[PDB]
Design a binder for this molecule. Structure first.
Ligand SMILES: Nc1ncnc2c1ncn2[C@@H]1O[C@H](COP(=O)(O)OP(=O)(O)OP(=O)(O)O)[C@@H](O)[C@H]1O
Ligand SMILES: Nc1ncnc2c1ncn2[C@@H]1O[C@H](COP(=O)(O)OP(=O)(O)O)[C@@H](O)[C@H]1O
Ligand SMILES: [Mg+2]
Ligand SMILES: [Mg+2]
Lengths: 97, 614, 338, 919
């Protein structure tokens, strides 16, 4: 629900004990933790990993945290297309690799 | 977590949703926590279980619960889909009213479709998954069996029960591996293990001092106890291996449950006669670390799982990845479809299509062969594929650059190209082998190449054929047998195809050998076929798949009676890596090790592994 | 037409039916419709049937029942040994089901071979049909592409070919020459030029298949004879007395306008319009040869109407009207309408 | 001015045909009420429409009220009617009801005097009617309670429908009417034979014998008299069925030992006794025989297993000759069911010799379903199950026991009456193991497989071998807690195996009850208590012999996942499609082939290879249904020439019947493919010379077409197909002479025997509903075009079956699944026609159906199987025969001579010089 998410989001704000020293930074950090732990409980073991990969890639996409990447390279990371053409490989390296 | 989550959030109006897996009970954990928070004798709070007719009692309990303020636990919520639509309406009315403070509604249900979206939304979700491991699974198997029943039973019967617990445990760990493992997903419950014990228990009480029959008991475990799950019958032979290795005369003496363990250094054995409490302690210590090798799989078979695991996490993450970066300058789906279209239009696809009339006219039809019949049927299927994909391509290519109505299936093809998944309509045509879109096109042109060499001198069969690149491999095998039946003087039905692995490479110009048919493009998984030895052996650790050399395929009459050879191992061949109802024929190959080892390892042949040169 | 006309006379003497195939433009219906008029009403009795894609097998029988008189016994035929011809148009256009076979068409096959039709009222009665002939007229790329091969076998196939320079010039050239000769002894040579021009424009559009073709959103774009025919019709509307004199400047303007108003309206996109105007100028400049560059032969301002004449007290006069004159007439007439 | 005529119901005037008025009244209420309120002009005069609308509304309530009372009153009154037995039982309600019926008969007569029923009904009358209906309901509730007591008394009544139950209780005196509905309760025992009574008015009580569903008579030892209470004499009958089966078996087994050494053959002994008892006694002396072979091999005689093999294989052959020589259809299966068990028996001993198992009490022997006829002096059978019948408790007379993998339970003697035993296969043997172990552990057994497996049929045939009754239930998601509980309550009371068809499609709500109900029964079986306590109606008789079987389909659409609690109770078994070799082997042994086994493995292999190498055609049927129809033809030809060997005969049959269906491209490969199987054997083409000669002569004389060697072969092939198959498909390409081929055949039959009328129509052309015929707005049924030809062809028309040897109705439309569905009853082997009117028409053996189609793409694969197909290759007929007929003008000349087409154009005279140029 939108409504349930809104109550968890607000709860995260009320849990913050910082008094305007570094509230704005610590609040963001506390929200992420608060929302993630709620959803993780809701998720199965196999999916819990998948959801954490999103959150970081979505923070990277929007550039909320500073990371060294390229938009084309993130599209290549999510889906790698196998390109034929070169027959010459190394013995140890697989043909698929 | 459950003690924390109730107190910290969902005080009122937000009911708590539990999702339970088989062998897990949410009610046992909540009741303990429930007692510490407030006085809960079972009067104040009611743990109402949802049954038919008890829907009115639950409605009365939840209605009473709101004005009173005591929390109410409901179980087996999925069992009544009509009442959830009714319940939803009651929760919406009570959210607007806002009955008594410190009231909650706990609901627990197996995950299923046709659960109302509204309830799942408003409610907090909490999942409880049991620890996943061979040891953790063996432990859960012994906890299920009542302490006071196992103590009563004598050392002989409890020792063989142990070996069964392991057998049940190892099957759940195989389910985690896709092709290399089972080849199919089958449901296994504790009730199917309990069932098997109760039968075993009776057989020991009858025999008494007289020696127990394993031969009688093992059939039951393979054909009945875990036969009921397996329909395919290839998995059944694998299922019997585990069983045959676990259950034998020497089981009652300390013996390794894991197969062979020649130079593996696990040294995990069945516990000797001792008190029940000592059985669990020994289980926990001796299992210690859980590896693929324990089940009979190769180490590379675990690496291959992390590969299959890794791949799924990115196929999901692709769907989840939102807004497609929100623009900005990456090529659009319709651009990417146009680019692939241009590459296909650059190639002479219309030229690659083979007119049936021209090829039939080249053949005299008096000197025609069974081989010639198979190719003619094969090229027809290819023509029907190649015409369809060119039609779908020239249509979608026209729709991009030309003002025309865009059909729903054509939008899906554009979407499938961007994703680089093989299209659904294309996949249905020709071979069922999953690949990348760029890999498929490269593979398709190698199929087309095999038909081009056929069109020139059709009457003269090529010295080396490639069964890896046919629409039906089986069809070709029936053909090679037909040619032998004309040359020889017995029934075709009697002749069975028998593969023999050859040390010669493609270089050899010798072809059309009397009572023979050459093959190549066979790939062996879960093992390595050494050329020098001339036998199947354990795989190289880092090499996942081992390509076979030139395969010679002879037809010879079946044996009069069922004959079992230790040297010969029967491995199935599959068209795709998936190995799910793509069985073609049983190939035979010579192995110094026992067959039991290889059926347990799961070793099979695959036609297309994407480890094909050029 | 003359050689097909001979083939029909051959096929009418025999009980063999005829089937005509070709595009919407080809002019098949008219070639049959001409013949049915020229045939003697005692020897042969003609009737037209047109399917709008809701014509059920029962509705076709009601049309056949009415056409056929009641002979002695169960047999039904025309009295005094008259041969009965039923003309069918848009043969494939009746609605096709899931199964790809048309209920109204399949009925006709039962009639051709067995010669017995079961009436929905009194289904026990055989109701045998005799001395019946069926003349098909089938448009390809329309409704069902092809009809059932077992019916098509009973019919002798014939094709009308698409319009040609030699075919168009002989048809329209003879209509215009007969009308333009009554207008003025001069401007006969201008008639032939206009026929080659209208063809030239028509031909340059067919050549550009990418630009203009049949499609989902181009169901109408299809360029027939009818648009050439109504263009040729609207010239024939022009009275002699007003167009008397030098027709080097006045006719080409009229033609160009009328041509433009049956092609512009066909086009949806302003891109297609631009392409057409270029072909129309090239066409005019070729057949005319020398024309003044001062005043464009075709222009958006240029309109022709025979209602402006009626306001000014001229009788059956169709000429170019200026934009400001048009304003005054419409505004006055609107007050009369109110 | 509207009205309601009273139709006497002997003796109550009734409102019949009210609905026609009712619908008109509803239409008047609809538009009339809405128009008055909505219309501004209508609003001014509303004081009129509203009063009229209220009157129209009043009419409907009173009209629904008699219908709700008359139908229910009719039913309860009919329970009281002619039931003094049931009248005396509940006096308080019977009297109250009789009071209400007489009142109702009077009120209806008074109404037939009054005008509009609603106007007559008023309000007070409506209230009185509602009170009377409530009083009648009370009677139904009282009667329902009485039915439950009767249901507790007899287990079979629960299975029987309440409408049937009521009928039986009403006609408790009339014995022959009761015996009619025992066919629904039992697997066999359709009715009972009876001694003609003393006074002809009375119906007989004295039962001398029982009659099966197939009319097999089992004579009772002495006279069986029907006592008073219907439940009490039926429960005495239920036991007298068993008693008589038991009494014969003791005689059967004594004569069984005697025939072995005796001069009288086995096959002759099988004839004398009944299909059930014969098959059991076969299996009993098979198990004794095998048991004597094991004891010898303990002695050391290697040949003991080989001789037991040899003996079993000689009786199989000797019985195979008996099915070939003309027999009685009842005696067929009485003998063929034995063929299906003795083939398995032979496969068992083959399997024992190959694996080299020389010990008794090996698993391999314990696995097989063994039947033992022994008075065990140390009887453990009193512990393993509960002793029910007298003979089980006697312990002085040999009882029949059934042993299989540590599950030993007595042969319950239910009467099945020669229903066909399924072919035994290594999967069904394995399946029997799973189900028996489930019962051994007192829990349910569930087989899960794909559609067409016929798992329900295997579970039935298992219980049939045991001789316990088997009941089949089908669930359409209308099953309730109460309706389901009654079945379980009834099943527990009387020892009976419950098999649930499409159990998967059950509401997850009602399923969670079933799990609790089943759990309570299973919990009682583990305790093994003689009596148990159900959730409602606690005190019910329990029997250990009862077992619950549920058949799930994983692939079925709208599947609901079973609860984990229920899944743990029912042991899952894996089910696969039965192997085509093992079914074909039985069908071949049914026709009497000595080498059937060897041929079957060869036959199946052909068909499996044929699908792969031949081009995919829709008209080709490679299914089991097509195989049987090819074998049945081969079987008549086998019976004709038994002395000829089997392999050469089969060769000729397979080629002959498949050639027509097969196209020219596939004819060359298929002929060469056949050569693989029988390379040494040389096939001789068989053609009837009399039929070929008359066809050639008729085609030159009156058809004026050239009798081409390819053409005449197709006509002869069609004529054969019409003889074997009642329904045939003359498929072909768009432009050939498909029509000419069937037309030539008729004119040949006319010259051969007598004139042959044919009714040609196009089904596709005419609307599917109008062809078959449907009800109009007015309650009157019009005869369909197909439906009238079926009435006309039987009698009172030109096509009447009086002087015509062979008639057939021709159809030349494109086959569709909607259109054929209405005709799918006629398509099937059973010659039954279904219509919307429900008028029953039976297709005569001399009636045939010929369908003529261009493409069989719209048709379903099942539809192609149902009938015998014939493909005519365009190149084989050609266009030359038309051209030759045109140049000769013989075709044209004949049409002008003999047609109603008087106005036909005269064709020109062709010169001998002109003909030779044109040709
Ligand atoms: N032996 C023959 N020689 C020449 N012409 C023949 C011969 N037999 C039949 N014909 C003609 O060939 C045509 C066959 O007509 P028919 O209706 O059987 O064709 P069909 O294509 O099977 O029809 P449908 O599509 O309606 O099933 C007729 O003109 C018939 O008279
Ligand atoms: N000689 C002619 N003079 C005028 N119009 C003709 C002539 N021949 C054919 N047509 C045209 O033929 C059309 C009617 O017949 P046809 O084109 O076959 O109809 P349809 O396109 O509906 O099949 C009209 O456009 C008519 O003008
Ligand atoms: Mg027209
Ligand atoms: Mg025909």
């Amino acid at each position: 629900s939108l409504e349930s998410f809104i109550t968890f989001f607000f709860k995260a704000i009320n849990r913050t004990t910082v008094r305007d020293e570094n509230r704005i930074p610590t609040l963001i950090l506390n929200i992420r933790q608060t929302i993630y732990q709620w959803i993780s409980r809701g998720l199965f073991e196999k999916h819990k990993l998948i959801f954490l990969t999103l959150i970081v890639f979505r923070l990277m996409q929007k550039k909320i945290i500073d990371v060294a990447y390229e938009v084309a390279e993130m599209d290549f990371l999510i889906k790698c297309p196998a390109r034929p053409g070169v027959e010459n490989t190394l013995d140890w390296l697989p043909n698929i690799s | 977590i459950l003690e924390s989550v109730i107190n910290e959030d969902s005080e009122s109006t937000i009911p708590i949703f539990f999702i339970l897996s088989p062998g897990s009970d949410p009610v046992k954990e909540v009741e303990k926590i429930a007692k510490k928070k407030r006085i809960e004798p079972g009067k104040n709070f009611f743990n109402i279980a949802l049954g038919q007719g008890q829907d009115e009692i639950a409605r009365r309990r939840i209605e009473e619960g709101n004005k009173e303020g005591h929390w109410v636990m409901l179980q087996n919520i999925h069992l009544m889909p009509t009442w959830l639509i009714e319940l939803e309406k009651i929760l919406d009315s009570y959210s607007g009213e806002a009955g008594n403070s410190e009231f909650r509604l706990f609901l627990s249900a197996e995950p299923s479709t046709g659960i109302p979206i509204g309830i799942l939304d408003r409610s907090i979700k909490l999942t409880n998954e049991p620890p996943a491991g061979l040891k953790a699974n063996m432990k859960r198997a012994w906890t299920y069996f009542s302490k006071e029943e196992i103590e009563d039973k004598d050392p002989k019967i409890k020792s063989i029960l142990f070996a069964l617990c392991f057998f049940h445990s190892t099957l759940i760990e195989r389910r985690r591996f896709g092709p290399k493992g089972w080849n199919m997903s089958y449901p296994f419950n504790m009730g199917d293990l309990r069932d098997s014990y109760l039968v075993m228990n009776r057989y020991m009480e009858q025999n008494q001092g007289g020696k127990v029959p394993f031969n009688d008991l093992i059939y039951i475990f393979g054909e009945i106890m875990y036969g009921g799950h397996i329909v395919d019958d290839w998995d059944r032979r694998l299922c019997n291996s585990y069983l045959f290795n676990t259950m034998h005369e020497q089981l009652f003496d300390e013996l390794e449950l894991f197969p062979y363990i020649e130079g593996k250094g696990l040294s995990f054995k069945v516990p000797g006669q001792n008190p029940y409490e000592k059985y669990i302690e020994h289980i926990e210590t001796s299992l210690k670390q859980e590896t693929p090798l324990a089940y009979g799989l190769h180490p590379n078979a675990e690496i291959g799982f992390r590969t299959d695991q890794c791949k799924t996490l990115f196929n999901t993450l692709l769907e989840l990845m939102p807004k497609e970066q929100s623009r900005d300058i990456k090529s659009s789906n319709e651009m990417a479809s146009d680019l692939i279209k241009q590459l296909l239009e650059d190639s002479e696809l219309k030229n690659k299509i083979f007119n049936m009339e021209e090829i039939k006219n080249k053949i005299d039809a008096e000197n025609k062969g069974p081989y010639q019949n198979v190719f003619l049927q094969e090229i027809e299927y290819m023509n029907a594929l190649l015409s369809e994909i060119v039609k779908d391509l020239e249509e979608i290519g026209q729709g991009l650059s030309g003002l025309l109505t865009v059909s729903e299936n054509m939008e899906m093809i554009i979407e499938s190209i961007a994703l680089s998944r093989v299209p659904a309509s294309w996949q249905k045509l020709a071979y069922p082998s999953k690949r990348g879109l760029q890999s498929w096109l490269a593979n398709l042109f190698q199929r087309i190449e095999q038909l081009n060499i056929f069109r020139d001198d059709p009457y003269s069969i090529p010295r080396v054929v490639m069964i890896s690149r046919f629409f039906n491999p089986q069809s070709f095998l029936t053909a090679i047998m037909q040619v032998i039946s004309r040359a020889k003087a017995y029934e075709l039905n009697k002749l069975y195809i028998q593969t023999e692995i050859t040390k010669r490479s493609i270089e050899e110009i010798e072809g059309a050998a009397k009572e023979g048919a050459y093959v190549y493009g066979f790939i062996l998984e879960g093992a390595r076929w050494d050329y020098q030895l001339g036998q199947l052996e354990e795989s190289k650790p880092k090499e996942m798949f081992s390509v076979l050399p030139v395969t010679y395929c002879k037809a010879i009459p079946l044996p009069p009676e069922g004959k079992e050879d230790k040297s010969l191992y029967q491995c199935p061949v599959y068209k795709t890596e998936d190995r799910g109802n793509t069985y073609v024929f049983t190939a035979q190959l010579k192995t110094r090790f026992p067959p039991r080892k290889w059926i347990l390892a799961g070793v099979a042949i695959i036609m297309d592994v994407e480890g094909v040169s050029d | 037409t003359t050689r097909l006309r001979y083939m029909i006379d051959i096929h009418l003497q025999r009980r063999k039916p005829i089937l005509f195939i070709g595009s919407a433009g080809t002019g098949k219906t008219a070639v049959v419709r001409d013949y049915l008029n020229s045939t003697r009403p005692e020897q042969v009795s003609h009737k037209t049937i047109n399917f709008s894609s809701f014509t059920d097998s029962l509705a076709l029988q009601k049309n056949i029942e009415s056409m056929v008189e009641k002979k002695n016994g169960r047999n039904y035929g025309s009295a005094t040994n008259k041969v009965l011809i039923c003309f069918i148009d848009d043969f494939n256009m009746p609605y096709v089901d899931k199964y790809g076979t048309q209920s109204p068409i399949q009925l006709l096959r039962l009639i051709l071979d067995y010669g017995s039709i079961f009436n929905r009222e009194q289904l026990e009665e055989r109701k045998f049909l005799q001395d019946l002939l069926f003349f098909g007229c089938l448009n390809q790329k329309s409704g069902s592409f092809t009809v059932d091969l077992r019916l098509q076998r009973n019919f002798s196939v014939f094709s009308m070919y698409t319009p040609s320079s030699d075919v168009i010039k002989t048809i329209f050239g003879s209509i215009l020459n007969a009308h333009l000769s009554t207008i003025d002894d001069k401007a006969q040579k201008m008639a032939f030029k206009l026929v080659e021009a209208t063809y030239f424009t028509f031909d340059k559009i067919l050549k550009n298949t990418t630009a203009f073709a049949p499609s989902a959103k181009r169901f109408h774009y299809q360029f027939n004879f009818r648009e050439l025919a109504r263009v040729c019709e609207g010239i024939c509307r022009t009275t002699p007395g007003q167009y008397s004199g030098g027709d080097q400047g006045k006719l080409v303007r009229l033609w160009a306008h009328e041509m433009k108003r049956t092609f512009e309206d066909r086009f949806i996109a302003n891109e297609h319009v631009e392409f057409f105007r270029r072909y129309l100028t090239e066409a005019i400049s070729k057949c005319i040869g020398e024309f003044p560059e001062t005043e464009n032969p075709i222009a958006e301002p240029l309109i022709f109407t025979g209602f402006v004449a009626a306001h000014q007290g001229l009788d059956q006069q169709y000429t170019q009207c200026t934009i400001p004159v048009l304003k005054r007439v419409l505004d006055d007439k609107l007050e009369e309408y109110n | 001015k509207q009205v309601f005529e009273f139709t006497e119901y002997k003796e109550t005037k009734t409102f019949a045909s009210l609905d026609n008025m009712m619908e008109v009244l509803d239409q008047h209420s609809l538009d009339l009420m809405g128009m008055k309120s909505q219309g501004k002009y209508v609003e001014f005069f509303y004081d009129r429409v509203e009063d009229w609308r209220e009157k129209l509304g009043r009419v409907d309530v009173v009209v629904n009220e008699w219908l709700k009372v008359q139908k229910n009153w009719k039913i309860l009154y009919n329970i009281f009617l002619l039931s003094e037995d049931i009248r005396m039982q509940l006096p308080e309600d019977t009297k109250v009801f009789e009071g209400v019926d007489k009142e109702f008969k009077d009120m209806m007569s008074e109404v037939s005097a009054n005008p509009s029923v609603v106007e007559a009904c008023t309000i007070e009358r409506r209230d009185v009617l509602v009170g009377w209906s409530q009083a009648i309901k009370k009677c139904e509730k009282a009667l329902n309670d009485y039915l439950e007591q009767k249901k507790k008394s007899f287990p079979r009544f629960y299975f029987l429908s309440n409408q049937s139950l009521l009928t039986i209780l009403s006609n408790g005196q009339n014995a022959p009417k009761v015996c009619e509905y025992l066919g629904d309760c039992f697997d066999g025992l359709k009715t009972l034979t009876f001694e003609p009574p003393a006074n002809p008015a009375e119906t007989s009580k004295v039962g001398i014998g029982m009659i099966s569903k197939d009319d097999e008579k089992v004579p009772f030892s002495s006279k069986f008299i029907c006592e008073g209470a219907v439940e009490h004499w039926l429960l005495n009958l239920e036991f007298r069925m068993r008693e008589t089966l038991q009494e014969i078996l003791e005689g059967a087994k004594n004569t069984a030992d005697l025939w072995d050494s005796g001069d009288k053959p086995r096959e002759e002994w099988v004839e004398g006794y009944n299909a059930q008892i014969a098959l059991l006694t076969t299996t009993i002396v098979w198990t004794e025989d095998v048991g004597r072979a094991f004891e010898d091999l303990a002695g050391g005689s290697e040949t003991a297993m080989k001789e037991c093999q040899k003996l079993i294989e000689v009786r199989l052959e000797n019985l195979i000759k008996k099915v070939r020589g003309d027999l009685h259809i009842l005696e067929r299966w009485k003998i063929i069911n034995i063929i299906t068990i003795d083939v398995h028996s032979r496969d068992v001993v083959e399997k024992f010799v190959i694996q080299k198992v020389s010990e008794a009490e090996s698993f391999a022997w314990l696995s097989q379903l063994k039947f033992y006829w022994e008075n065990k002096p140390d009887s453990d059978m009193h512990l393993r199950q509960t002793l029910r019948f007298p003979w089980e408790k006697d312990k002085n007379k040999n009882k029949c026991i059934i042993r299989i993998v540590d599950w030993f339970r007595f042969y319950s003697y239910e009467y099945i009456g020669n229903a066909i035993r399924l072919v035994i296969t290594p999967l069904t043997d394995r399946c029997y193991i799973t189900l028996t172990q489930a019962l051994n552990l007192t829990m349910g057994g569930a087989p899960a497989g794909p559609a067409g497996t016929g798992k329900t049929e295997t579970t039935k045939d298992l219980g049939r071998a045991i001789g316990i009754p088997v009941m089949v239930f089908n669930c359409s998601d209308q099953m309730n807690k109460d309706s389901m509980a009654q079945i379980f309550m009834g099943l527990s009371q009387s020892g009976a195996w419950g098999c649930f068809d499409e159990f998967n499609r059950i509401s997850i709500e009602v399923l969670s009850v079933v799990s609790t109900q089943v759990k309570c029964v299973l919990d009682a079986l583990k305790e093994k208590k003689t009596k148990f306590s159900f959730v409602e109606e606690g005190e019910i008789q329990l029997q250990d012999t009862v077992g619950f079987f549920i058949t799930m389909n994983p692939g079925y659409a709208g599947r609901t996942e079973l609860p984990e609690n229920l899944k743990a109770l029912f042991r899952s078994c894996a089910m696969v499609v039965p192997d085509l070799a093992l079914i074909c082997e039985n069908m071949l042994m049914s026709e009497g082939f000595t080498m059937a086994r060897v041929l079957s493995r060869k036959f199946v292999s052909l068909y499996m290879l044929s699908r792969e190498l031949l081009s995919k055609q829709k008209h080709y049927d490679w299914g089991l249904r097509a195989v049987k129809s090819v074998l049945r033809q081969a079987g008549k030809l086998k019976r004709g020439d038994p002395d000829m060997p089997e392999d050469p005969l089969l060769m000729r049959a397979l080629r002959d019947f498949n050639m027509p269906k097969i196209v020219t491209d596939d004819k060359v490969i298929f002929r060469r493919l056949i050569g693989d199987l029988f390379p040494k054997l040389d096939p001789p083409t068989k053609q009837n010379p009399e039929l070929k000669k008359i066809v050639q002569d008729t085609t030159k004389k009156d058809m004026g077409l050239v009798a081409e060697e390819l053409f005449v072969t197709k006509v002869v092939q069609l004529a054969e197909i019409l003889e074997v198959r009642h329904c045939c498909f003359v498929i072909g390409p768009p432009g050939s002479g498909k029509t000419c081929v069937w037309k030539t055949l008729i004119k040949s039959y006319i010259n051969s025997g007598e004139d042959a009328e044919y009714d040609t129509l196009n089904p596709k052309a005419v609307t599917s509903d109008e062809l078959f015929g449907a009800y109009t707005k007015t309650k009157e049924w019009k005869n369909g075009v197909i439906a009238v030809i079926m009435k006309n062809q039987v009698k009172n028309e030109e096509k009447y079956k009086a002087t015509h040897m062979h008639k057939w109705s021709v159809l030349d439309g494109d086959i569709d699944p909607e259109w054929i569905e209405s005709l799918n009853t006629v398509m099937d082997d059973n010659k039954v026609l279904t219509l919307v009117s429900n008028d029953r028409i039976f297709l005569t053996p001399q009636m045939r159906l010929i369908f003529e189609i261009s493409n069989l793409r719209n048709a379903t694969p099942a539809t192609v199987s149902r009938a015998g197909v014939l493909f005519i290759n365009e190149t084989d007929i050609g266009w030359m025969p038309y051209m030759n007929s045109w140049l000769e003008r013989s075709q044209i000349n004949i049409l002008k001579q003999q047609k109603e087409m008087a106005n036909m154009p005269e064709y020109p005279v062709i010169d001998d010089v002109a003909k030779s140029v044109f040709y």
